[PDB]
């Protein structure tokens, strides 16, 4: 019963189809590695300035491929939008459910290094 969050987004291996929705499953045969450009963009999305705070970049590298906790799964709507569904309680969101946690880790680590 996965459904995307209301409104529009804010800009094995095989997927499993439930209704018109696609539940994207991880493929254990390979390991996808995102590009450095994506890691920099994700770094800026969680509050890192990569030019001024390169010492925080390791948190963006860890956070960008963070496994989804619990029974969270990535899903794709009929429009192609990616969202995340919590199959334990039916909660839906556009963001990766660990992004907020890594935003806080960036804040704590920034102070730890003055």
């Amino acid at each position, epitope marked *: 019963f996965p459904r995307p969050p209301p409104g529009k987004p804010p800009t094995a291996g095989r997927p499993l189809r439930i209704g018109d929705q696609l539940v994207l499953e991880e493929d254990y045969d390979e390991t996808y590695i995102p590009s450095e450009q994506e890691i920099l963009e994700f770094a800026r999305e969680i509050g890192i300035d990569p030019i001024k705070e390169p010492e925080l970049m390791w948190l963006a590298r860890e956070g960008i491929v963070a496994p989804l906790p619990g029974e969270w799964k990535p899903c794709q709507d009929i429009t*192609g939008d990616i969202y995340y569904f919590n199959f334990a309680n039916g909660q839906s969101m556009w963001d990766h459910p660990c992004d907020e946690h890594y935003r806080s880790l960036v804040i704590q680590e920034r102070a730890k290094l003055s």
Partner: nanobody, 120 residues
Framework: SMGQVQLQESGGGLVQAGGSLNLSCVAS???????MGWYRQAPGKQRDLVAD???????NYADSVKDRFTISTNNAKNAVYLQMNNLKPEDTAVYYC????????????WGQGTQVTVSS
């Protein structure tokens, strides 16, 4: 890698109703994608799935294009294709290729879009 994976589309064009068209998309690099799909969007309308294909050949088609459209991949060339037969004017739209990889987070990549125009 340093640069993001880029989906390069080709094959859009102009055709009369009943004619055929072919779309192609090639992904830069040597990435392995869990899913590859074709979406389309007419102005003022929602982007909608046309056809997607899993890494092992499982396909899903929109009800309006089944038995007229056919999606296939050549994973050795990181390419996905769309065959379009018996095109109708209601098939007129910008067609987008999508590729999705998963490593905890789902990574979704989109081609630049190519327009298919079917006249009467």
């Amino acid at each position: 890698s340093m640069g993001q994976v880029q989906l390069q589309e080709s094959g859009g064009g102009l055709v009369q109703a009943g004619g055929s068209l072919n779309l192609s998309c090639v992904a830069s690099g040597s990435s392995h994608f869990n899913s590859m799909g074709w979406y389309r969007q007419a102005p003022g309308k929602q982007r909608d799935l046309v056809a997607d294909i899993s890494n092992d050949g499982v396909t899903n088609y929109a009800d309006s294009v089944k038995d007229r459209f056919t999606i296939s991949t050549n994973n050795a060339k990181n390419a996905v294709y769309l065959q379009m037969n018996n095109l109708k004017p209601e098939d007129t739209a910008v067609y987008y290729c999508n590729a999705v990889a998963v490593a905890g987070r789902a990574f979704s990549y989109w081609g630049q879009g190519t327009q298919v125009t079917v006249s009467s």
